[PDB]
Amino acid sequence: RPESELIRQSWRVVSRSPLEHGTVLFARLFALEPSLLPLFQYNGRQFSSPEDSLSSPEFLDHIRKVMLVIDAAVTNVEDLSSLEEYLTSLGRKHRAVGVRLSSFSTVGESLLYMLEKSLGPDFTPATRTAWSRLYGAWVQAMSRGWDG
Ligand code: HEM
Ligand SMILES: [Xe]
Ligand SMILES: [Xe]
Ligand SMILES: [Xe]
Ligand SMILES: [Xe]
Ligand SMILES: [Xe]
Ligand SMILES: [Xe]
Ligand SMILES: [Xe]
Ligand SMILES: [Xe]
């Protein structure tokens, strides 16, 4: 099925410059859910305002990490069974870190916003609903980290 090629096609534009695009992603996220900010604790300090995050090298490395894990999920768009065991542990990591299950709908909304603003004309509704089901599956797997 070329639902998996809508994704691969949309991703190649984005994956051209991942840090620029993942910066869009996290600016949108904090605009939607300001209380996600304090969970990025590096040397036990809390950023005051969203813009403080953009000067932090650790924060920017975490962006590069987000974009590599999305890249991996793309690279396995049919058989996301490979990544399950990893995504589960990635979930549990984020549970320890303080992330709550409800914050996934926000991360999802931010991913779509970033895709939408990046592809403009090409973000067609089949593309949206593709990313939307992929993301839903990435989410099911990550959720095992909260205990099934
Ligand atoms: C939703 C808000 C998020 C918050 C608040 C958050 C916060 C954190 C924190 C505090 C860490 C540990 C310190 C660090 O490695 O930089 C971390 C690690 C990580 N995050 Fe996130 N994160 C979020 C979302 C995500 C998403 C969506 C992905 C991937 C799609 C992601 C991928 C990772 C990866 C790969 C690591 C490294 C984990 C390890 O191997 O130890 N994070 N995150
Ligand atoms: Xe940001
Ligand atoms: Xe920001
Ligand atoms: Xe890293
Ligand atoms: Xe990256
Ligand atoms: Xe990437
Ligand atoms: Xe997350
Ligand atoms: Xe994501
Ligand atoms: Xe994803």
Q: Is the dihedral of CA 108, 131, 52, 59 positive or negative?
A: positive
Q: Please give the Cα distance from 136 to 131 (Å, whole number).
A: 8
Distance from Cα 29 to the centre of ligand 9, integer Å: 15
Q: Please give the Cα distance from 65 to 44 (Å, whole number).
A: 20
Helix (H, G, I), strand (E, B) or coil at 83: coil
Q: Please give the Cα distance from 88 to 143 (Å, whole number).
A: 7
121 neighbors 9 (Cβ within 8 angstroms): no
What kind of architecture, by CATH, is found in domain 1-148?
Orthogonal Bundle (1.10)
Q: Please give the Cα distance from 85 to 90 (Å, whole number).
A: 9
| Probe target for ligand 1 pocket from 32, 33, 40, 65, with the most ligand atoms within 8 Å of CB | 65
The experimental technique behind this entry is X-ray
Angle separating helix axes 4-15 and 103-119, nearest 10 degrees: 80
71 neighbors 15 (Cβ within 8 angstroms): yes
- Residues marked as binding for heme b? 62, 94
Q: How far is CA 130 from CA 2, 20, 39, 64, 124, in A?
A: 10, 23, 30, 23, 10
